[PDB]
Amino acid sequence: GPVIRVAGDSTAVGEGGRWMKEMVEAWGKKTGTRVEYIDSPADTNDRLALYQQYWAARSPDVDVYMIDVIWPGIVAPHALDLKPYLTEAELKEFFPRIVQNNTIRGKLTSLPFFTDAGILYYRKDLLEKYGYTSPPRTWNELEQMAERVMEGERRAGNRDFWGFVFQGKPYEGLTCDALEWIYSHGGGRIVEPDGTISVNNGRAALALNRAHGWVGRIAPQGVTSYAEEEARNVWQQGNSLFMRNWPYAYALGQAEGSPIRGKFGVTVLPKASADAPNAATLGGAQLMVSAYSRYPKEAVDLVKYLASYEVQKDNAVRLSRLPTRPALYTDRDVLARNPWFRDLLPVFQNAVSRPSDVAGARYNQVSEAIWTEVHSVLTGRKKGEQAVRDLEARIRRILRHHHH
Numbered sequence: 001g002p003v004i005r006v007a008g009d010s011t012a013v014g015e016g017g018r019w020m021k022e023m024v025e026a027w028g029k030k031t032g033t034r035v036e037y038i039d040s041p042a043d044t045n046d047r048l049a050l051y052q053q054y055w056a057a058r059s060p061d062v063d064v065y066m067i068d069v070i071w072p073g074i075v076a077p078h079a080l081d082l083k084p085y086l087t088e089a090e091l092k093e094f095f096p097r098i099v100q101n102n103t104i105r106g107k108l109t110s111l112p113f114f115t116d117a118g119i120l121y122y123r124k125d126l127l128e129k130y131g132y133t134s135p136p137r138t139w140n141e142l143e144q145m146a147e148r149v150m151e152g153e154r155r156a157g158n159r160d161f162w163g164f165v166f167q168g169k170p171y172e173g174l175t176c177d178a179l180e181w182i183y184s185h186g187g188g189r190i191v192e193p194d195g196t197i198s199v200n201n202g203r204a205a206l207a208l209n210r211a212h213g214w215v216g217r218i219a220p221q222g223v224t225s226y227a228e229e230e231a232r233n234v235w236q237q238g239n240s241l242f243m244r245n246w247p248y249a250y251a252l253g254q255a256e257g258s259p260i261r262g263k264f265g266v267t268v269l270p271k272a273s274a275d276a277p278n279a280a281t282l283g284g285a286q287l288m289v290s291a292y293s294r295y296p297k298e299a300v301d302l303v304k305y306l307a308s309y310e311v312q313k314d315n316a317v318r319l320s321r322l323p324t325r326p327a328l329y330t331d332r333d334v335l336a337r338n339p340w341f342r343d344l345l346p347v348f349q350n351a352v353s354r355p356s357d358v359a360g361a362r363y364n365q366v367s368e369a370i371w372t373e374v375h376s377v378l379t380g381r382k383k384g385e386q387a388v389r390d391l392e393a394r395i396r397r398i399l400r401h402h403h404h
């Protein structure tokens, strides 16, 4: 009978790929359907290019794809419209904002799977060791705490120790980090939902100059090549006071044999001042049935299973990844394992989006301009002032004649 083939998530990032394959096999076993899992590269933008090869070829060789929240506008032609396969009540069990994100020109491209938001990880043991009672609320405080704790730990002999790690590599992760920096300095959303390219302003330039000031100082020099796992590895080995990362790092840091188990908390990222907005970049994944699948009915059943209450629960409990079902945030088991899901729920609800809605199918080109210009600041090649001006000009070129 049919073999249902899935590409989604990566065995190169935490437990996501291994867990995905497990869930797919569990569906196979439960329904008596053969399945295969195709692995993907770590970085989301590498995955887009890979999947685009299948799509260009109209390939039937993958039935279900896991897609990034930033992709619906790009991948819509390659998606089976799911709208006819779900009742309004079923669809209403997901966050409306994400169902809306996934709906392009009335086509429901994909089912919400997990959401995501950038957060601050911090070493509670080290904060207490150095006389601090709360994580930093401002970037200045983060800098001050990082400098003092680094000095003491280095003095105590940990030559691997840093104040702060984050994602500085030139790729989509850097777009995510940089939207947080810019937005939390009152610098806007880079490209506003209305289409205005707003990034050329003093607050955005300050934000980028501030991040350059971290490199080689409180953050390793090599942070300019760090993606999520590079940052997580330095953090998890116990060698960073602070990390900016996504929810998935929490379960991994708590696992048996993690050097930092029981020693950390999470909170909202800092901001430039009390009246700036909190910044948490919206992330997440959706489940798409391929328009080129020979088995749409079976693919849809798999997608419904993966997005179900109990699979999302398993993802929450075991991998500390955020449900797309509001009902899971009141589930006793989800909460007892991850109490911070409740504490940071409003942070997740107010997460700021990358400009994927307004850029649509040109989002990947916009994002590439953003991460390359940001990276030029992190490396000391350009000041933030020049970078935001050059970025404005690039984005204008890229989006000229695009209307939302």
Ligand SMILES: OC[C@H]1O[C@@](CO)(O[C@H]2O[C@H](CO)[C@@H](O)[C@H](O)[C@H]2O)[C@@H](O)[C@@H]1O
Pocket: 009, 010, 013, 016, 043, 044, 068, 069, 070, 115, 116, 172, 173, 174, 176, 228, 246, 247, 248, 282, 283, 284, 285, 321
């Ligand atoms: O594969 C799922 C896994 O990928 C991550 C990054 O490791 O996804 C987040 O980060 C991306 C940028 O690098 C964003 O584009 C994406 O939207 C966001 O979810 C993990 O957090 C997630 O578990």
